[PDB]
Amino acid sequence: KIYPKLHQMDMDKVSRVYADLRRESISTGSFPITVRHLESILRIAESFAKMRLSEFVSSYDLDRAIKVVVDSFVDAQKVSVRRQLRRSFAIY
Amino acid sequence: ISQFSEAYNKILRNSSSHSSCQLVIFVSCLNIDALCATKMLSLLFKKQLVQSQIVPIFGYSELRRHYSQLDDNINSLLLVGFGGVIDLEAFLEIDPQEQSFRRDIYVLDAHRPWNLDNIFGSQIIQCFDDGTVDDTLGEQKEAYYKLLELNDLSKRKQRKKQIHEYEGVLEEYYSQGTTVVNSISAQIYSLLSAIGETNLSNLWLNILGTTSLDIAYAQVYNRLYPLLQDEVKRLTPSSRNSVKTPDTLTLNIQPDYYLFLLRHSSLYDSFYYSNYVNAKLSLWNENGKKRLHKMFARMGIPLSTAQETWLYMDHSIKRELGIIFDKNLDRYGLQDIIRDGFVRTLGYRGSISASEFVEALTALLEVGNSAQKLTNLRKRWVSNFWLSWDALDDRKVELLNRGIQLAQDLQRAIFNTGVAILEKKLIKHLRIYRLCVLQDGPDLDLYRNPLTLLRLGNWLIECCAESEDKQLLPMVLASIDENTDTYLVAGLTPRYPRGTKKPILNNFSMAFQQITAETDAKVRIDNFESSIIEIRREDLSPFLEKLTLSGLL
Amino acid sequence: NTEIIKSFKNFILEFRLDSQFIYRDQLRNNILVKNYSLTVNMEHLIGYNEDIYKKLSDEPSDIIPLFETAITQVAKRISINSLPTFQLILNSNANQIPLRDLDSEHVSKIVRLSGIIISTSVLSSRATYLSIMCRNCRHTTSITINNFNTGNTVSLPRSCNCGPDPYIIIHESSKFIDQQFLKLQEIPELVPVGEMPRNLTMTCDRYLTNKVIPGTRVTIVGIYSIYNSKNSGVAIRTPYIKILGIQSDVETVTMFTEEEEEEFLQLSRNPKLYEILTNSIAPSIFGNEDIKKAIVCLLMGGSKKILPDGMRLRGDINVLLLGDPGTAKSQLLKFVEKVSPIAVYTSGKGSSAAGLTASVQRDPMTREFYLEGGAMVLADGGVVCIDEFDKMRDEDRVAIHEAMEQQTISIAKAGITTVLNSRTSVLAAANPIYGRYDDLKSPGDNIDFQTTILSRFDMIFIVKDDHNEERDISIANHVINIHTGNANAMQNQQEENGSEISIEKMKRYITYCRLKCAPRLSPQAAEKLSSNFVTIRKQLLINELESTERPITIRQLEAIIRITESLAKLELSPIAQERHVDEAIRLFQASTMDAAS
Amino acid sequence: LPAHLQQTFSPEEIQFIVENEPIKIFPRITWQLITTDDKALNNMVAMRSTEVVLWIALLLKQQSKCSIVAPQWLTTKELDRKIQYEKTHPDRFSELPWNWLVLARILFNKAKDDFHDPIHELRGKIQDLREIRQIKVLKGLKYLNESHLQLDNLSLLEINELRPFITEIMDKLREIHTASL
């Protein structure tokens, strides 16, 4: 049944918030940032919204969506990631 | 305040010229009620072969951009839809020019109250008050004859109180809800009938023109069916077929429905996108959804059959359809659907409900197409206008099918976006009135057309309140996409469930004038329509607070 | 029953939709044609009589003969021998039905439907008329099949002792027709669920036959019914459906309307006629316009030079999409298939069950043998999409090495050794090994091992995805805009309104073009190029002076040559431009760069 | 320089020609106009038959101030004897108003209202005779040779559209044979 949809307005932040999530995340490892990886965050977002039964994307839906991805990408890093942890704090 | 014929006869002496003519009909503006009356009149001069300009005015001040622009040899003039509120003597000025004046202006407006300056001070007018509300309306008599020309201190103080007495009286009039009386084409047809002409087309046009506001009550129209119904009696091409005939092939009365796209869509969605069906059945929700299907379970209708084209419905499904309606729809309060409103029959090209005929024309309005962009886009509406005027043409029906289809595209997003709004519960109940705003959505450009949210709001206001106790109320609406917070704001009024005891008119339009007479920052009366206004989101918030109070109603 | 004929005859005559009636026109229109056909609009039919439509719809099969036998009547009026009965095709677009649902209720019910055909049978005769005589009595008789739903419906009457049924066939005097025996399958998109798509045999007769290419997306109408046959139960009959009429989405067919040429001429005049197509291919896609551009040149078809001797230039080239995932190249080819009028998307292995090798298979009955078909044959003379090309089994991968150049496949399997013709233009999307580091490596050491696989390829692309912040955030947001409210999708309207290609028309444009112009290069373009590669041939060997291993062939230049007619074909010009050539150089130079790495 | 057509007459031209033909009408009317070649007339009696040129009849009919006479030759029941006469004469094309094609097309534009059931009537009737005349053209058209053509009775409209056909033909034929001499 339920088919969530984002409103492009508040979603602009993620394109901005992602910019933090690539280059700085690029700074370590190789890359391993992927174009596809960003596509996931939406498929991520769609889930919680239906779980919210909102029929459309909400910010709180993204709140998990980002956090789900953040440390997920983080843990892939070496023990040097403890340093990588501190920068991701801005994305929390 | 004069008989139409002699006024029309008055143009006759002013008419034929080489180079002609010179008069110019004003097409003003968006509302279709003018459109029929233009063509009937358009055809009228065709009968006389009378040359003249045809101008689809849009901007309320655009005529000032025009009247102040092209007027040269014009010895006579006719305008439509405007002047019933604001004076062009102020708007144009005018400036009495040479008694036995060089130019005269017919002013078409169906809206009341008339401007105070309209009837009296006959100049270009030819005040259009005839023959609807004369009334009297003996109040305007004291607004001038008393007002004009207006121990001695007692008689002087006695006059002013009388002045304020009449001013106090005159203060109420002209401050009041602006409302249409009746479809102008009808009186024009009366003039058309006055000269004796009755064309099945022309009557159909009245049938067409009458249909224009039919989405909003009647209100007189309820008695105006028979006035047309008499005409269908006044005309009987033959006692019997005479099949088809291949040509005329003419209209007949039918059991019409508030049901939408009847012939032109699957009966299933026909309920689904029907607005009257919407709130009564609460169509957006899944709960009442099946209940309609339950009606097919009552109607004994196959779900796929509802998916089926109206063209191919079984003759059993056909003849029993209304009987099925007779045995079902009343249970749901759907009993007021069936209408005896007239239907054109093109035979080989098919019969059509004028109501359905209208909505296709309505689709032409918003589609089928710095500050210069709005004039550029409004021009597109005018650019898109004649294509709609082209849809007025009879032989050209094929083009109509685009709007016939596109109309189906409209409500699909219409029924779509609105219900999306329903989930968020964006209505502001406030206290004095129900209030809403659209801050966001896809394709607000399509929503830029007043009719877009207008059909929407009407689809909303009746949706949000059936009622839906208690107290049907006027709705607030706004929307924005681009052009720096234009936020078109169109007026909205409560709809009775087939039970308009009072006119109740309009308030906020005066109230919108209250704020435009107020600090009026970023608010724009640029809309020809009083109900609709442009506003910045920046200044509308206080405009809202200014709108919330003072409430005029 | 009888005399319902004239009612159609009335609509055959009495009907005039203003200002001009149609079918009465269509008849004489078909008359000089000797078309012997009529295409009826059923949705139009209801407009005439409401009764006879469903009056027809009740038992449409029985009133089928009520037409063509009637259409001849005034046609015979207009003819004033021998005059075979015309073939009517009625049609309607109104309510389309899923293949997933066919109810026995629909038997003897006409249904319009979209469809995707698996294949069609070789044509076979049906005798509309026959003469027959007693093998005993010497009695003279004649019979016809005037119409039919195969039954068999009729047989030899046994009343001439003499019997049984001594009357016998006479073929010479008898007259005949044809049938296609189509096998159609439902659209793959929906709604197979986890289950395999049902397939259905559609009956095409006379003019119906040959009207449709196998495998094509098609819209069709006809009647649901069932034939007992034998070759089920108890007493159960197998499903079959009549095809009438079939009005199929164009083409889905070398011919087309004349005004189409003009509107294209409007496109041929455009200075941006090529450059707009640069955007059209990738509405959702962002960047890689070079590879994006490299698409179109192959889209118009390759050079065909047949002049003696039998040596002939091939088409269309070869291309490689190799690069790290996130290349969206597989997504690209999915657009590619949609853009090609005839193309096959193959990610295999093969696709989907298709033998990457066109292969041999035996006939179940009567033994024998036949070509089972192959993707090269399926799409022949058209686009080829390939994924996992590195994941391809090397043995039939070998056949690929042949398929691209000689463009003719031959197999000795069983007794049938015949050499098939394959004119397809293949493009290889196979992913490179080990991500980025292979670029740190030689350009080779990827495909198989040897670059001889590359040798047969022409334009091979190595995607370099670099993590540039501004470069991503551009397309990054470009992604979100692709999504609800589908902001990017609404942008195309103004692009559709002002300029940008609709791409379905473009397909018709290309199909138009592909058959239209035969561009032959101007003499000076070659010398401009001959002077070009000789440097490149000499220069890359200067890179080869270090014994650096990577490559170059004279076939490398010939591939470039086909680029000459490529965009020039978009120009429609009879001969290749001098100026036109140059972009091919710098574009192929970008391809040569992949060797440079 | 006409370019197109230009050698053949335009159908719009020939109708422009047939406009010049006089016909009787029933004016609503009771200066002058002098005009040029009309010679007519005294202010015409309302509801009275008078012979006048075609296109002018279109004028007052365009204002609906006049009522055009239906052609006596235009009677569908009467026209059947023609198709009767036509159906029995594989060779001869019988008799023609000679402008009549454009007439019926023009007659039904406006003046349609004057006749008794012209609707769905002669249009089919005229149409049958149109092609049966037209078909007899091509049937006899196989006989086409230099230097003579017995064209006999035909409507100039079809005669116009057929112009490019045969005119381009015999010239080939006449040339090739005479050239062969």
Ligand SMILES: Nc1ncnc2c1ncn2[C@@H]1O[C@H](COP(=O)(O)OP(=O)(O)OP(=O)(O)O)[C@@H](O)[C@H]1O
């Ligand atoms: N130029 C581009 N335009 C549009 N989308 C892109 C582009 N580049 C990457 N993407 C996005 O990245 C994703 C790539 O997924 P896709 O499955 O198409 O990768 P692929 O390159 O086809 O895979 P492979 O490399 O295995 O062939 C898609 O969601 C796509 O939207």
